[PDB]
Each structure stands twice: as structure tokens, then as C-alpha cells.
Design a protein around this ligand. Structure first.
Ligand SMILES: [Mg+2]
Ligand SMILES: [Mg+2]
Ligand SMILES: [Zn+2]
Ligand SMILES: [Zn+2]
Ligand SMILES: [Zn+2]
Ligand SMILES: [Zn+2]
Ligand SMILES: [Zn+2]
Ligand SMILES: [Zn+2]
Ligand SMILES: [Zn+2]
Ligand SMILES: [Zn+2]
Ligand SMILES: [Zn+2]
Lengths: 265, 263, 265, 264
């Protein structure tokens, strides 16, 4: 009886299906894959990347940036929703290949630095190349790049360091408040009496409320399907996109269902 | 004109006056200096150290451990109230010289790893040797060593990673609920509109309430004066020590006055 | 066509075949798998582990330690030949589950801390959970545990941080000088004009000489086949083992052939 | 009673700000009168080799501004060795600029612990820790614009001590600049040092390495070691040592120290 072979983080093909840049607002573009969000915000003072998707997505991201007129040197900042392999995957490589520095909260920083290992729920099941944060941010802290202001909103649950980022762009000669809210799922998590996360339920409850109150004209999520985006649909990608309020409400209802099932017995 | 010389974190003499171990309960001892707390909890499964004081206290702590019958190998765990120089100072050296591993929350861990540099309020004024945390703890998480159970209570404010640790020891044939609550001070802090700590006020207010509600037969604090301990007085050191409620009340009062003067 | 799926570090079944502790000398035991070395060296003051094999080997190592009378508290030190996945794999987990601290040279420490990512030759193909070194060692430095003294001998090549560890144990009332020499292979490596490792050839050449000159009654290697050990043969496991000289000479030959092939190509 | 914490107090000249002093077409001394901090500026970004003391961060930034180098323009930080008097402001510079650090493994580990647990100084000279972004190997090259930097390991003063070499121009001719690290062993236990068993061997190799460097112009982290006088402006390098003279002087001093140690 040999030990099991290691398994890589294999995923649905659509998570790895490359797409051309899709314009969300005047300065904001979806540059990831059909089923994983990676947002490029272009400012007069360099570019900002929010999430990168999977580890093998680095070169694709760089190719899309080039199409947008962004050189590796132009990329100044990487922000993250949470430090799982399907969102922070290519961060280490992007840091080696670009001028980009990472800003994240302490919880996301520590998970990123250990490459997603010793996950509270997944253990070492979903690892990726580790990276160091260049700046630690606090809840409500702002970062300004080229007159565009990004605000962090902590929403602990999916991971302890789960974060929503908000900024104001423009579209059709009008300000548009963009909310990139993190995942609110608890996929296979032990919810009550979890020794690794004693206040998990309380944190999720606060996070549902936080997501509801976000400045949110346009909502996007790390997994686009969670906010009902269809990136493959092009110009009508966000035709049926959920609001922050509807997103949180659906998430809490799922959560409540899971909590009920767990209580038996 | 030459740039100013660097300035060291210079402290009151009493913070640097060694003392012999002072018994708090059957397994819990104050082993730091007269004016800085360092708590040794001795179990049949090894020893736990809560805070180490200043960087220069490492050898003294080891002297006191040996006096208590705890070898460098016997020290298993280091816990921290917060990662300032006056409490986490000797952690790196203790890690090199003992079997000890550090458990801390993410905020304390990142501050520890940068040796207290780029402090939200103090800049680089209070640096110390950096150290890596061996285990990251979440709010309410328990750590059991030799049948003694330590519980973490996050109380953000003084630092983002400020933590209270509680455990039950025995004294006089009865259980004693010990609370090692962190500093609730905001010394010279900008409280409102602080870009480095936007929700400082909310965190402090939650922390006052957390401390007030702690399981707390005996309160100890990293700076013993904050809870009215006098370690140099020996047997009557904690005779007039504050309750957790009194400690939080005084802290909130001081905070409220500071906030009023700022607005 | 989507981006390629991630590929796991899959290995020969024999690398993952657990074995019971095999005694090498009075205080030195092989406790890994049939085809990956993990050495337990015991003293009255605690135990040392030299290498752990693959990431999935953690629980097996702990079980074998238990069988040898080494509790998690008794494991004091982890040393490494080199920080590849097939030798440092379970180090992070062992640190979490035991009192063990890691001592390694700066090169090995930096590779361990990035979990084998950005490997000079393998890129991100062989990643594992990252870990921090607790102590940095210099060439020729000794570490004493109980009455046993371990000496580091730097032998850069296979990795920049490649190290041989030597100590003296006993067998049949007599001292036995054990040499745990690191790998001297260059599997698929670009040898000449490698921008990531300009002095690769020079380092290997000095390393062949270093291995040749080690205090060496008993040679052991991270991959037992390299020193002609057969861990499945029990009492006769080391009956056909190579000397340090023979091991270095064969490795230099192989290397010379590889260099000639590269030069021709 | 226990002693107070120590601050790294230094000679006034080490903290004496100076305006940028041109060494060659791309290369400027931008530190203080008695601590080297070299700025190399290209159309594809600037490189800083050493920063001096921790309190020098704002001064370096002011001098960069004077040279037309914005915080965003600063791409790379290289180090001679990771002591407080050279890597001091690195953490702050990383926070305030786009700069990333390239260093060898030895320098990276020392930098990450802010100079603490020094092989010889213990915790006597500490500074704010920083992480390296790129690990370099011996002989590795880094290209920024038209400038090519080559690393030459010269272990001794610290395990990670490195010389950096590049070719600039001066009056229509190539000038091979060698920024050689310290070859001093101040108060060091040389023989039988358990923390550095092969110290003597490494130093002797390092003297030879420095002697052989491509070296039209030598600069050193402590400029006095190579007989530079930065305060003298246009005359600063008029009596600068060759790489050979620098290495020879260092070896003679080292030999003297070893003799004294063996005798005592
Ligand atoms: Mg026992
Ligand atoms: Mg002068
Ligand atoms: Zn996730
Ligand atoms: Zn995900
Ligand atoms: Zn404090
Ligand atoms: Zn304090
Ligand atoms: Zn290998
Ligand atoms: Zn291997
Ligand atoms: Zn040029
Ligand atoms: Zn120095
Ligand atoms: Zn110096």
C-alpha cells in the first residue's frame, strides 16, 4: 500500500478558457478567463490588477495587458479578493515579471506567504507558489493610483482575510461605483465548533451585512457565476448581473441551509 | 547639517530591574522585571511563556526558568499580548536558545516578522529583532499544554493584533480564572481619521467590552501598573490589583477624554 | 483551446512505498519509503531527522518515530540534503506537528521558504508547502544533539544549497562514520551558459571532489539507488552500497557525458 | 539591572548630506559624504546600489528627485552587504518607491532579519528588515536599459558580501566601474570561529577576487577604504585606489590581525 500520488488543482475548462479584454467601465477591464475574474484598472499613473486567477494564467494576463497598452513596467499594484490558488495563483510570477507590488490585509498576507498551504478547511489540498505582500492594509484603508481611490472592506468568512475592494470609475459620462466583492461561499466547511475558526458563523453574518452596504452600482465577484456574470456573452455579459444586496441575500440563505444540515446531528 | 543620530527605545529603570520568580497561582509565575510582565506557566508537558518583555531580558528569563526547574528544552510555547518591543523584544533570541515556538494571530505575526518596524503610530522608533510565528491563531482558538487550556480573545486597538489570553489555574485548592489582558492604551495616537487605522475607534470600543466580559478572577497586564500590580512588593503584589471591569472602565474613560480633545 | 491544466509531481510507486524502520547503525535508522531516504538519528536528548521525502510522507514518518520511541516533543531537529519536493516535502507539516526546528544553509533556506517554486531548472513544476528555517548554517559548521555532532559540507550543484551531513555513530562496538551525501545529478539541466547559474559547472566539479573526500565508512544518499542501497532488502540493505569515492566518480562520469552531449547539440 | 538598548551611533560625516556627485555618464554618488549610495539612471528605470544608514531614506529620495528620478522610476536596489550602514533605509525605500531588491541568498537572509543575529555583532547593529524580490547567483547579470550589472561574490566581511561591476562612459570612452564590498574584519574572531569555520579561506579568496575585477574606477561602501573624498567634489576620486591596491592593503591588515590573534 503505497501512499497516494499528489494531485494538482485541476479545474473546469471554462476557468482556463482565455478571453479578450472586456470593458466594464472607462478604465476597468475584465482580462482573466471566461470563468475567473481578473480586473485591470488603467490610470494615468500606471495599472492596478485585482486578482490574477489560476497559477498558469500569468502569460495570458500579461498578453491582455499589452493589448490594453500596459507594459509589465506599467503594472504597479496587485490587490486580492482572497489568497486561494484560483485567485492568487500567478501572483508570485507576476511579481517576478512586472513592477507590481502586492497590498493585502494581514490574514491574506500570511496565507499568500505560505502559498495557500495549511488552509483552515482544505489543508494542503490547494497550494500555489508563495508570495510576499509589499503593503499591509487595514479595514477601510484607501489606496490611490492615478487619482482613482480603492477602498478595502474586510469580509471574513470564505477565508479569514477575504476582502472586497471598491472604486469609482465612469461610464457613459456618469460616475459608476464598482464593487469587487469576495466569495461568500463555505464549500464543505465545518461551520459550528470548528477549532481552527471558532467565530466562523459570526464573521460570515457580519460579512453578509458588509456586502449589503457596499457602494455598489456594479458588482463583480472572483467567480463571475456567483454574481451571475457571463463573460463569454460579451456586450451582454453583465445583463443579468446581481446586485451586492441580492448576492449577499442568496449567500446567507445558502449558508443557513448548510448550518441547518450540520446541526443534524 | 548632519542628519540626526538614531535613538534607542530607552525605558524607565524599573522596567529593567530583574526580579526572582513571583508565584501568581500553583503553576503560574511572574518571571520578568519589576515593571514588565513575563508569565511562565509550568505544566507536566512543558512550559508556556506569555510575553518576554524587552529584548535585553532574554538571559534573565532563562535564569528564572532554570530557577523554576525549566530547561531551555522544556520551554515549548511563547504567546504574546502584542508585538511591541517591550513585550515581544526577546522572542527571536528565545527561539534561538530554546525549544520554544510562537503562536500568534496574523496581525501580531506580521508585526513580529518586521521587528516592530513601520508601526502604525510609532514608525521605526521601537524596532526589535524580527521573528517568525510558528502557528497562526484565530479569535477564540484554544491551545492545550499539559492539561492547561489557553484561550485567545482578540482585542484590537493598542495594536491591530492585540490579544488577551485566559486560562484556569489553581490556588488554595480552588480554580482561579486568570486573564492576561493586553494594553488598552492609545499613547499619543491619532484616533479619528487615521489613514493607517480607519476603524481605530470602533475596534477600541469593542475591545473595552471584550475585556470587561473576560473570565477574570485574577487580572494581569503587560505593563503591571495598568492593572495596579506592584511586583516589587512580593506577597502583596496583587493585593490591590484591578478587576477586568475596572481596567476597561479606566481605559475607556482615558480614551474618551483623548477623543474629546481631538475633536 | 483552454490554458493547460496544472500537473502534479507524480513519482515512481516505490518512492511512496512505506517501510518499517531499518537500522543503519546503533542510533541511525532509515524511516522513509523504500525509494526515498529519511534518516532518524536518536540520542538521549532527542532525535534528528535528515530529510522527510515527499509531502504525503508526514504521518508515516511520525508513526515510525513513535515506533522508535520518538514522540513529537522528542523530535528536535530537521536537517536537509536539498530543498526539493522529494526530500523537503513534509517539512512544513512536521514543524506544525512536532517540536522540530530546521537548520539549513542560506540557499536551502530561501528555496524552502518559497516551497521549491521558481526553481533554477524546474520552474514551478515541483512545488511543495513552504517552511522557514530556524537556524542558518555555514560551511563546516557543526550542530550537536546529545553526544552526536553533525558537520555540514556544502556541495552546490544539484541545488545551490546542496549539503552533505556527516556524523559518527557505532556498529558492533566500533565507530562508524556516516556520510549522507546529497544528489550529484543534473537531471535535464542546462549546464553551460545558464544565466540563472553561471558557475554551475565549476560548482559541480568542486562538489565531486568534496564528496570524494568525505569521512565515509557508510555512504547514504537521498535517492538510495545513487549509492546502491536496497531498503527493501532488510539486514542486507547496505551490503552492496557504494563508497563516497565510487559515488562521486560515477556521478562525474555521468555529468561529463551530459556536458559532452549538450556541447555537441 | 539590565542595560538599555543601544542605537547605532556613527561619525558625523557618515550623516552629512551631499548633493549628487557624478562618477560617470549614468552613475552618481547620492548618499552622504562618508557613506556610498550609488544611483545608476537609465531610460528603463534607475538602480540604487546601497542606501547607507536608516535615517538616509528621505535624503536619497530628494537626491533622486534632483536627478529626474521619480519614486516610480526607481526599479532596483542592489546591496554590497546587509549591514545597517548600507542596507539601513531599504525597507523604507521599498515602501516609498517602486524599487525591488536583488541580492544573494546570504544577503537576503540577513536583510530579512534586519541584521540581527549577526555572526560577529549579534544584535548590536540592527535595522528595519526587508525581503529580497530576486535571488542572484555568483556571476549572474542584471540588465537595466543599456547597463549590465555583474555580481561577484566576495564572502568575508559578511557571508553575502558582493562586488557589483558595470560599464559606464566618461568623455566618449568606456569606464569599467567596480563597486567592491568591504574587506575589513572589524573585531572579528578569525580562526576557529564556530559561526564561520572557513572565514580565513573565504577572505583569502575574496582578496584575489577583488584584485582581478574589471576595474577602471573602484568605489567602496565606506569611501575612505578606497581613498575617495566625496566632499572634494570634482576632485573626489583624484587619489582613489586601484582594485589591486585596495585588496593588497586589506590583506596586509588581515594578516596583521591574524598574527595578533594567534599570538594573543
Ligand atoms: Mg520520553
Ligand atoms: Mg571627510
Ligand atoms: Zn476561495
Ligand atoms: Zn476560487
Ligand atoms: Zn505596546
Ligand atoms: Zn509595552
Ligand atoms: Zn533534487
Ligand atoms: Zn530528489
Ligand atoms: Zn543610457
Ligand atoms: Zn559591514
Ligand atoms: Zn559599513
Amino acid at each position: 500500500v503505497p501512499l497516494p500520488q499528489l494531485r494538482a488543482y485541476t479545474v473546469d475548462a471554462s476557468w482556463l478558457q482565455p478571453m479578450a479584454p472586456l470593458q466594464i467601465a472607462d478604465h476597468t477591464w475584465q482580462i482573466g478567463t471566461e470563468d475567473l475574474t481578473a480586473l485591470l484598472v488603467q490610470t494615468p499613473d500606471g495599472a492596478v490588477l485585482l486578482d490574477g486567477g489560476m497559477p498558469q494564467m500569468a502569460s495570458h494576463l500579461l498578453d491582455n495587458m499589452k493589448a490594453r497598452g500596459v507594459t509589465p513596467r506599467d503594472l504597479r499594484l496587485i490587490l486580492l479578493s482572497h489568497a486561494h490558488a484560483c485567485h492568487a495563483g500567478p501572483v508570485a510570477e507576476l511579481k517576478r515579471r512586472t513592477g507590481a507590488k502586492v497590498a493585502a490585509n494581514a490574514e491574506s498576507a500570511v496565507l499568500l506567504a505560505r502559498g495557500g498551504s495549511d488552509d483552515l478547511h482544505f489543508g494542503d489540498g490547494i497550494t500555489y507558489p508563495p508570495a510576499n505582500a509589499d503593503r499591509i492594509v487595514m479595514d477601510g484603508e484607501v489606496i490611490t493610483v492615478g487619482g482613482i481611490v480603492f477602498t478595502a472592506h474586510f469580509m471574513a468568512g470564505h477565508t479569514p482575510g477575504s476582502t472586497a475592494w471598491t472604486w469609482t470609475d465612469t461610464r457613459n459620462g456618469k460616475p459608476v461605483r464598482i464593487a469587487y466583492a469576495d466569495s461568500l461561499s463555505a464549500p464543505g466547511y465545518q461551520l459550528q465548533g470548528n477549532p481552527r475558526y471558532p467565530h466562523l458563523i459570526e464573521d460570515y453574518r457580519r460579512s453578509f451585512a458588509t456586502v449589503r452596504a457596499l457602494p455598489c452600482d456594479v458588482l463583480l465577484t472572483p467567480h463571475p457565476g456567483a454574481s451571475n456574470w457571463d463573460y463569454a456573452a460579451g456586450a451582454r455579459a453583465g445583463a443579468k448581473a446581481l446586485t451586492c444586496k441580492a448576492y449577499a441575500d442568496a449567500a446567507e440563505q445558502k449558508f443557513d441551509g448548510q448550518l441547518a444540515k450540520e446541526t443534524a446531528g
